[PDB]
Design a protein around this nucleic acid. Structure first.
Lengths: 209, 56, 60, 114, 120, 122
RNA sequence: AGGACCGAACCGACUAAUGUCGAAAAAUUAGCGGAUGACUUGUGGCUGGGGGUGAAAGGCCAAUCAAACCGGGAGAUAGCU
RNA sequence: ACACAGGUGGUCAGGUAGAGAAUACCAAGGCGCUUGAGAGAACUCGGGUGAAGGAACUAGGCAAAAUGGUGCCGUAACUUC
RNA sequence: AAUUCCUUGUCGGGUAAGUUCCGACCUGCACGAAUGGCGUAAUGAUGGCCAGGCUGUCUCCACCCGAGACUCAGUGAAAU
RNA sequence: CGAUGUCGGCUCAUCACAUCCUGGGGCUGAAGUAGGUCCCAAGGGUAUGGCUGUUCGCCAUUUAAAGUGGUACGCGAGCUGGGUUUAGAACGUCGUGAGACAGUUCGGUCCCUAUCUGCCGUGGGCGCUGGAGAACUGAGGGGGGCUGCUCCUAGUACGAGAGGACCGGAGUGGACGCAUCACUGGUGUUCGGGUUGUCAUGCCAAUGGCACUGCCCGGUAGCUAAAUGCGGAAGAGAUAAGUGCUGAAAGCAUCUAAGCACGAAACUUGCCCCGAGAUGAGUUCUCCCUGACCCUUUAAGGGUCCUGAAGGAACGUUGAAGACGACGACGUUGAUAGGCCGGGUGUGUAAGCGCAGCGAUGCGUUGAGCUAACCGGUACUAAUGAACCGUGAGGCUUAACCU
């Protein structure tokens, strides 16, 4: 089926009765109101796009405000788009809520991870640091060799080198849902999801199930 | 770590295409004395947003 | 070969080990510069060591 | 935030006895010994206390037969049935990690009795 | 990578940086306007503002904590007697950063920082 | 967290006083052994009339660690010393007849039942 | 008493890191050996080029040493580039 | 060759602590080392700390960590005593 | 063996495992008596080996504090 | 030979298949288990130590296994310098001797700030044909692909017994990879306390500077891992070797010639990320602008006056974003930062006073005081009215259309 867009609210834990403490991530999922429905008659693929939360009146532009009045919805922060799966059908304004995940059992969470900056080869690609002593001159954490010799004569493409780490879309798969809390608009997945506290998260059910 | 042969005045010139200065174009006019200053910086006399704030 | 004098001792595969798997005795040779002479010496050296394992088979 | 703050204090037990570090405390812990669900006892000295609300925890050092055992307990876990202060100790430090090298007569601590 | 870290290091070690704001808070009290660089002004708010909140309760222990800071007996007398009851109505934000061109000698962003009364 | 070159104490009265860990068994390239994991030890010290003597190579199961085990509730049980009970390399039901000091609950699995029945605590 | 002992000034230079278009044409930092003696240092003398001097390494003899530097024979000679 | 982290003989020598001219902090007196302002990546340099292990590192315990004072008790093989 | 080629000789010690070390044998390629032989207490910024303590030396790196690196302004090189 | 630095270690690899493990098979002198040999197969994986400068090697103990090779016997403008190839010195030996030895031995300065390609990142320009703001389809590119053990099937098939399955099904590890900071811990020179030596604040008490943060004991938030979640798949398509069905050439036989069905971690997909500079520059939604003119080489021409749209940038407060640009939020019609208020945490009973003791000090007020990066809240301070970039209905040829 489709998934929903929500915001990450820290981490907690749930002491279950049987003597187990399972760590949960509190994901708040407000109402995801649909702004546009797509189909093969106009687009070639059938999908919807939703929006969540709220924005200010002055911060939203003129093209984005005329796109929301087309749907009749409240203006919401950004737009995300979900591919429909040939069995369901939504309308423009159908306020999709966290009631979908009382059906499901395991989810997939996608969010922009935490950014580490220009990270070196020991941190980014898990390289072994060289020896801290025994003669070593200015070459402790440096990456070592990067190529062979005259016969390649180059560095091969895709070489594990130092650079931008994090700040990148990643999907942790197959996370258990612990509680679907519909009065509080809360989803409690089990374990760790990407991104800092307050980032966006795209929770959809487990494709590998 | 040394060059193999000298670059041209063409290859010297393209590296400096990004080295150009920008004009600020954002001089404002004071509310009281009508004088030029930067945004959020006080004037030469000492006015800022209409008020003689430096008394100097 | 293990030794010294130049990297002539450490560039060419001039040693040889002839290992006799029906017995398990390891005859080696590093005596010459050329592999073909070391293999020729170590082959005759092992046929002497196959004499002695057949003497000690008789003598036991 | 208030979402977590609400979600945690609905889960905290509301009968935790007020103990300080240095107190001899007999913590009584559920244990599943196969089929039967036994409640067993652990009596040592509280050498450390972490306070985080629901995530609060305290570490109890017990010198058992042989050598010392330093077990920590998650405070609001359902595994701890009863926490009971037996003796009240008079230290002036929030973490008693100096007590790991001290054994025996040097490991003993002062009564409060105020 | 300083995720969620306050404090500016300002190319000084922790001894030097603590000693200069201790001097520079004494300059802001005694002259009621000082000219400095703009990153040094914004870290000076995190030093002078807790002093004036400390100076609201005129007690002997507060006289000694405001002497343990700033190490100056003339400053702790301009606090608690002049700056003390003059900002007693205001709820924080006793100061004001006014920017002023650049420093001529090194192109540094200069800024006036002053207490918000100057109604002498 | 017991690895190569780790000197451990001995819980049982097999005769060994100090043993040293030489190998962590089970799974190649493995870092360290833990709660109740099998290791090859070597015996670095012995009492004169023990069942074993110095310089004998045999197995051991780790029964106490200073890193400490974790129960699923979040709690961690730590000790002041690494200790182990010795095995035979071929035939189980370990060597000793007494066991000194406590062991832990995670050692209770189907084959160390001799150990958690002789141990005076837990 | 002591070519005694520990240890600064002073003399030296064993290890490591830095430095290697250096701060410096052998140094800095952290340690290290001697430190009343075959000690060290100031000033001034003396020994000279197949010569000096050398608790000896072909070491040193003005950042130059299996024969110093400056001038000269001299535009040595070069079947070599 | 420099307004150069080097070299350069003698003389004077305060306070508290100390055996001391060591070392720490100070007096008298002199200085802040003639580019600064930010930011707070990789990496390098000079450091601080580390769970559990404890030389498994490596040519090698290299480098670091550790040992460190005074008074007393005690002190082995060997020995030219 | 500061000497030994074959050689990681063989045996013992030490180690879970010891081409090095220690002891012993002697088949000394090619020790040997002032170009000294063999022992030797003390000594050594000496060569090798072992043990204890100790440790980011390492498993395996994490964090922090400073100086550069980076950006802005001023001056402004070098080998090639 | 007007210089292509060298054995081994370290870091980092990459390809080949003549496959070491896992996967698919044929034959067996294959009962089973475990093999042996050969065929297919390169997707992933493929030790740790003792000795040695050693590559090797032997030894110890593991592993599903410890593959063979190529890449200047990959890799010194990446590190090391133990080895070998400078000068010192000695031993054996050769020589009358200077000295010499794929004989041994002790000691011995490893330089380079990256122009170009390559690569890792991250931006500026202009392009995409009116200008914009978004969300996308996806050409194409990358990543990932390992595996043990245990139990069920079943102590059944097989076997005289010992032993002991195929095929399915479940759990739980090792190694690796990604994410995160709730747990447990590390750190935390911006927090609190203890304490040594000294100096200062007139002095007492109280503090502050310096001594590696003086030495230390703790410790918030961040970052982190030894911590804790997750991953490898299932399925589909076409096959490799192999197994077949029907079937002639060739009355039979025959998997192949026509026809038809199976078959692996390989291949294309499935799963994850990038991605329309995919110049083949795409689609979809919304927003914005409809004014006069003279000239002339009337041309998709040039010039003026008015009018500045959507949106941008700029600046400022800044951010769990970041080298710098960039990206994200906020700018008063405001919680973006700091302050402040309450709370939490941390350290641990502040100073002052009082009593007790000759005094050190204890006790009471008192879980007091202070408390950074945190939590909720509050316009007190700073985010100024603006000016600026971007314009003024958007080419021609056709077609299908309504007109």
């Amino acid at each position: 089926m489709i998934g929903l867009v929500g915001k990450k609210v820290g981490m907690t834990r749930i002491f279950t009765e049987d003597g187990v403490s399972i760590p949960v991530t509190v994901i708040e999922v407000e109402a995801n109101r649909v702004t546009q429905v797509k189909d093969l008659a106009n687009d070639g693929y059938r999908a919807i796009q939703v929006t969540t939360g709220a924005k200010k009146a002055n911060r939203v532009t003129k093209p984005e405000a005329g796109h929301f009045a087309k749907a009749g919805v409240e203006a919401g922060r950004g737009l995300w788009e979900f591919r429909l799966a040939e069995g369901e059908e939504f309308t423009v304004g159908q306020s999709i809520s966290v009631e979908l995940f009382a059906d499901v059992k395991k989810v997939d969470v996608t969010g922009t991870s935490k950014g580490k900056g220009f990270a070196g080869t020991v941190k980014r690609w898990n390289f072994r640091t060289q020896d801290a002593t025994h003669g070593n001159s200015l070459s402790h954490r440096v990456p070592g060799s990067i190529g062979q010799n005259q016969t390649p004569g180059k560095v091969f493409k895709g070489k594990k080198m130092a650079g931008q780490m994090g700040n990148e879309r990643v999907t942790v798969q197959s996370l258990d849902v612990v509680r679907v809390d519909a009065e509080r608009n809360l989803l409690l997945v089990k374990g760790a999801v990407p991104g800092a506290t307050g980032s966006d998260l795209i929770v959809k059910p487990a494709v590998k199930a | 770590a040394v060059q193999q042969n000298k670059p041209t005045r063409s290859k010297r010139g393209m590296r400096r295409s990004h080295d150009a200065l920008t004009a600020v174009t954002s001089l404002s006019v004071d509310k009281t004395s009508g004088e030029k200053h930067l945004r959020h910086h006080i004037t030469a006399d000492g006015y800022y947003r209409g008020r003689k704030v430096i008394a100097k | 070969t293990s030794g010294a004098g130049a990297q002539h001792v450490n560039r060419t595969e001039s040693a040889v080990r002839i290992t006799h798997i029906p017995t398990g005795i390891v005859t080696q040779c590093q005596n010459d510069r050329s592999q073909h002479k070391n293999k020729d010496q170590a082959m005759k050296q092992m046929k002497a060591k196959l004499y002695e394992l057949e003497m000690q088979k008789k003598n036991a | 935030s208030n979402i977590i703050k609400q979600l945690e204090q609905e889960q905290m037990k509301q009968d935790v006895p007020s103990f300080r570090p240095g107190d001899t405390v007999e913590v009584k812990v559920w244990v599943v010994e196969g089929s039967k669900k036994r409640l067993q006892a652990f009596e040592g000295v509280v050498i450390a206390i972490r306070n985080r609300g629901l995530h609060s925890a305290f570490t109890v050092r017990k010198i058992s037969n042989g050598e010392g055992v330093e077990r920590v307990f998650q405070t609001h876990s359902p595994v701890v049935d009863s926490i009971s202060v037996k003796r009240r100790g008079a230290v002036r430090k929030a973490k008693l990690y100096y007590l790991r090298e001290r054994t025996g007569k040097a490991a003993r601590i002062k009564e409060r009795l105020n | 990578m300083r995720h969620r870290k306050s404090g500016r290091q300002l190319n000084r070690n922790s001894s030097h940086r603590q000693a200069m704001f201790r001097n520079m808070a004494g300059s802001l009290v005694r002259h009621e306007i000082i000219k400095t660089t703009l990153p040094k002004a914004k870290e000076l708010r995190r030093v002078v503002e807790p002093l004036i909140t400390l100076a609201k309760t005129d007690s002997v222990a507060n006289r000694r904590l405001a002497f343990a800071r700033t190490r100056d007996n003339e400053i702790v007398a301009k606090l608690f007697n002049e700056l003390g009851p003059r900002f007693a109505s205001r709820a924080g934000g006793y100061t004001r950063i006014l920017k002023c061109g650049f420093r001529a000698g090194d192109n540094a962003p200069m800024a006036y920082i002053e207490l918000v009364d100057r109604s002498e | 967290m017991i690895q190569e070159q780790t000197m451990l104490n001995v819980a049982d009265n097999s005769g060994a006083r100090r043993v040293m860990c030489i190998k962590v068994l089970g799974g190649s390239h493995r870092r360290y052994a833990g709660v109740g994991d099998i290791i090859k030890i070597t015996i670095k010290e012995a009492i004169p009339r023990g069942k074993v003597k110095k310089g004998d190579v045999l197995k051991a199961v780790v029964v106490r660690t200073k890193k400490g085990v974790r129960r699923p509730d979040g709690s961690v049980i730590r000790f002041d010393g690494n200790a182990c009970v010795l095995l035979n390399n071929n035939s189980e039901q370990p060597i000793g007849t007494r066991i000194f000091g406590p062991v832990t609950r995670e050692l209770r699995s189907e084959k160390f039942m001799k150990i958690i029945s002789l141990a005076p605590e837990v």
